[PDB]
Design a protein around this ligand. Sequence first.
Ligand SMILES: Nc1ncnc2c1ncn2[C@@H]1O[C@H](COP(=O)(O)OP(=O)(O)OP(=O)(O)O)[C@@H](O)[C@H]1O
Ligand SMILES: O=C(O)c1cc(-c2cccc(F)c2)nc2ccccc12
Ligand SMILES: [Mg+2]
Ligand SMILES: [Mg+2]
Length: 260
Amino acid sequence: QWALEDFEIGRPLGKGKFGNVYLAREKQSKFILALKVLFKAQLEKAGVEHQLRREVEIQSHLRHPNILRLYGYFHDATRVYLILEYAPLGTVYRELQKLSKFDEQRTATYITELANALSYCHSKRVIHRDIKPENLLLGSAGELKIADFGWSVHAPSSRCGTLDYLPPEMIEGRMHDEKVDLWSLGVLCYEFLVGKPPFEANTYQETYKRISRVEFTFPDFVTEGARDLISRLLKHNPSQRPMLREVLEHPWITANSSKP
Ligand SMILES: Nc1ncnc2c1ncn2[C@@H]1O[C@H](COP(=O)(O)OP(=O)(O)OP(=O)(O)O)[C@@H](O)[C@H]1O
Ligand SMILES: O=C(O)c1cc(-c2cccc(F)c2)nc2ccccc12
Ligand SMILES: [Mg+2]
Ligand SMILES: [Mg+2]
């Protein structure tokens, strides 16, 4: 259905572990899109060909204003091509670098959109397991959009990078469910307000200890409504974390998030 012939390749949009993302335009419709390239050599050597097919199937069946659309895909003699929706405002990661911290309005709005998207994700019983600011893009009106889906799967499961966003049941090799995403939401909220995630360390081996113990402290400026929600999401026992409906209705979310 799709071949590389059908697009014109603009500038690079970012580097992934297995290749680049380029700006691109469909020649006959003039549609603007992002076109992720992955190299088959490196995909074979790493052994993720089947894992990538799992990402591609889960993502093409999702449609939500805060999930990044996958339109299609194709491959050739040496590479695989994912045709993704183009997010014109870049990543949340670069927004943090430029501003250092976020105010409570931006944070509570981002947490809302994140929780909405993860609610829909769970209704199709999909778990993302890897929401990093690296993987949260921003639409042309500033809306938050989840991307990647590289390490995502169906609940439950038990299948690299930094430990920082992984919950304790995952880093301990144990079995994990849909509350993996609730711990992740707690980590982002912290990082959005503070400028660094709550378990950062300069070594992998200490981030392990600090996640496992849940050893973290708030600085002065974090108001008590935000300490309340974060502490309720960063709980070693998965069952003691709330569900997304409680998050969407937390007094701190409602007072600071923007309206529908
Ligand atoms: N649709 C897009 N629009 C703009 N920038 C993007 C888009 N998709 C990705 N990027 C940028 O390119 C980078 C790499 O993309 P991505 O995270 O999807 O690759 P990856 O992490 O290597 O995926 P994989 O799990 O398959 O190895 C991102 O960190 C982001 O900065
Ligand atoms: O055997 C293949 O031709 C092949 C196909 C694909 C591929 C094609 C469509 C979708 C998708 F997710 C992956 N990925 C690969 C990765 C490494 C080595 C070979 C391949
Ligand atoms: Mg094959
Ligand atoms: Mg990524």
